[PDB]
Enzyme design. Structure first.
Site, PDB file in Angstrom:
ATOM      1  CD  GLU A 157      -3.257  -0.781   0.006  1.00  0.00           C
ATOM      2  OE1 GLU A 157      -2.826  -0.057  -0.268  1.00  0.00           O
ATOM      3  OE2 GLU A 157      -3.694  -1.596  -0.009  1.00  0.00           O
TER       4      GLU A 157
ATOM      5  CG  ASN B  19      -8.967   6.547  -5.193  1.00  0.00           C
ATOM      6  OD1 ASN B  19      -7.407   5.747  -4.969  1.00  0.00           O
ATOM      7  ND2 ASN B  19      -8.859   6.605  -3.836  1.00  0.00           N
TER       8      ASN B  19
ATOM      9  CG  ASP C 129     -13.596   6.998  -5.343  1.00  0.00           C
ATOM     10  OD1 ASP C 129     -13.060   7.463  -4.888  1.00  0.00           O
ATOM     11  OD2 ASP C 129     -14.315   6.969  -4.946  1.00  0.00           O
TER      12      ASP C 129
ATOM     13  CB  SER D 122     -11.505   8.377  -2.247  1.00  0.00           C
ATOM     14  OG  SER D 122     -11.686   7.855  -2.902  1.00  0.00           O
TER      15      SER D 122
ATOM     16  CG  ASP E 272      -6.823   5.516  -1.162  1.00  0.00           C
ATOM     17  OD1 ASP E 272      -7.690   4.745  -1.140  1.00  0.00           O
ATOM     18  OD2 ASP E 272      -5.965   4.507  -2.120  1.00  0.00           O
TER      19      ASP E 272
ATOM     20  CG  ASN F 226     -11.282   5.499   0.116  1.00  0.00           C
ATOM     21  OD1 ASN F 226     -10.406   5.623  -1.310  1.00  0.00           O
ATOM     22  ND2 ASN F 226     -12.589   5.677  -0.101  1.00  0.00           N
TER      23      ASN F 226
END
Ligand SMILES: [Cl-]
Ligand SMILES: [Cl-]
Ligand SMILES: [Cl-]
Ligand SMILES: [Cl-]
Ligand SMILES: [Cl-]
Ligand SMILES: [Cl-]
Ligand SMILES: [Cl-]
Ligand SMILES: [Cl-]
Ligand code: NA
Ligand code: NA
Ligand code: NA
Ligand code: NA
Length: 129
Positions: free
Chosen positions: A35, A46, A48, A50, A52, A59
């Site tokens: 990660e 992201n 969308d 969002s 992380d 998220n």
């Protein structure tokens, strides 16, 4: 902060992640490796909208508040910035809620694709724990 491999394993164990929801310490170390490469300050936007955050790339759609994710929740009740701390406490506490959510560690797509089913114990091999 960029943790060393055994250093993060020890921190994760101290915060009670070892065998949490039945996932051995190596699972958690593996997930952090892919990660964030063990970097608490890692961030990723992201498609969308969002983002992380942190060593386990948690998220903002569900788990933390960053003020810029329309329609999102903050189930861990934290600013996403707490996930970037050299102190992994907020990351670990939030990961415990995430892994309890129903799908176990499959919530982390990188865990499913790169860690699940592999020799995850390799990630803690050699470490004084
Ligand atoms: Cl490594
Ligand atoms: Cl393990
Ligand atoms: Cl805000
Ligand atoms: Cl928001
Ligand atoms: Cl909420
Ligand atoms: Cl906040
Ligand atoms: Cl820590
Ligand atoms: Cl499970
Ligand atoms: Na994180
Ligand atoms: Na949010
Ligand atoms: Na944290
Ligand atoms: Na891989």
């Amino acid at each position: 902060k960029v943790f060393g491999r055994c250093e993060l394993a020890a921190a994760m164990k101290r915060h009670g992640l070892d065998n949490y929801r039945g996932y051995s310490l190596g699972n958690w170390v593996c997930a952090a490796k892919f990660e964030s490469n063990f970097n608490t300050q890692a961030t990723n936007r992201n498609t969308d909208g969002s983002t992380d955050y942190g060593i386990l790339q948690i998220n903002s759609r569900w788990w933390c508040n960053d003020g810029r994710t329309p329609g999102s929740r903050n189930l861990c009740n934290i600013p996403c910035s707490a996930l970037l701390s050299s102190d992994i406490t907020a990351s670990v506490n939030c990961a415990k809620k995430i892994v309890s959510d129903g799908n176990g560690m499959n919530a982390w797509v990188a865990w499913r694709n790169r860690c699940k089913g592999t020799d995850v114990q390799a990630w803690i091999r050699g470490c004084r724990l």
